Amino acid sequence: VNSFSGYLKLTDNVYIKNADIVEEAKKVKPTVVVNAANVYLKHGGGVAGALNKATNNAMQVESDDYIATNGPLKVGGSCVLSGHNLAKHCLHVVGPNVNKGEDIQLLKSAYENFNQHEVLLAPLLSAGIFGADPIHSLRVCVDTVRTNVYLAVFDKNLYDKLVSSFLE
Ligand SMILES: COc1ccc(C(=O)O)cc1
């Protein structure tokens, strides 16, 4: 039903909220939730681990089946799998891990996957353990994505920095 509420307009197609993306997915029933994935679709921590836990491991079993046919995803790549109880679809997207020397330029590729979907509930890509500056990631999202993105940011201090950078 894509019942988004309380999202702050950044641009005509990019919205942001200080929220837990799992709790958003349950309230919003989005067509697409984006997972911040790794190439093996192993949902061991961060957003991935949270989404998977909220599916009680349904997401991990399906992800394994996919990886059995595909092998690992490419950096900047994606796959569309079931959203289970969280969403119709989960778009698993792999941003570059800059800690492992993956090039930050691949972040554009990663966000370009969002343009295959009219409306998404998403995290910021390559944040947290993949080591990209989250405000940089937001700029790449705004520059790259032309479909309607609803970004959930868990941490209030980071949320305020993002909104301050964008609007002040
Ligand atoms: C709860 O997540 C969803 C959202 C949309 C749909 C649908 O439109 O079919 C199904 C499940």
Swiss-Prot record:
Q: Tell me where in or outside the cell this protein is found.
A: Host endoplasmic reticulum membrane
Could you tell me which residue ranges the Macro domain spans? Answer: 1-168
Q: Which reaction does it catalyse?
A: Thiol-dependent hydrolysis of ester, thioester, amide, peptide and isopeptide bonds formed by the C-terminal Gly of ubiquitin (a 76-residue protein attached to proteins as an intracellular targeting signal)
Q: Output the superkingdom of the source species.
A: Viruses
Q: How would you summarize its activity regulation?
A: Inhibited in vitro by GRL-0617.
**Assembly description:** May form homohexamers. Interacts with N protein.
Q: What is this protein called?
A: Papain-like protease nsp3
> Which species is the source of this protein?
Severe acute respiratory syndrome coronavirus 2 (2019-nCoV)
Q: What is the lineage of its organism?
A: Viruses, Riboviria, Orthornavirae, Pisuviricota, Pisoniviricetes
State which stretch of the full-length protein is shown: 1025 to 1192 of 7096
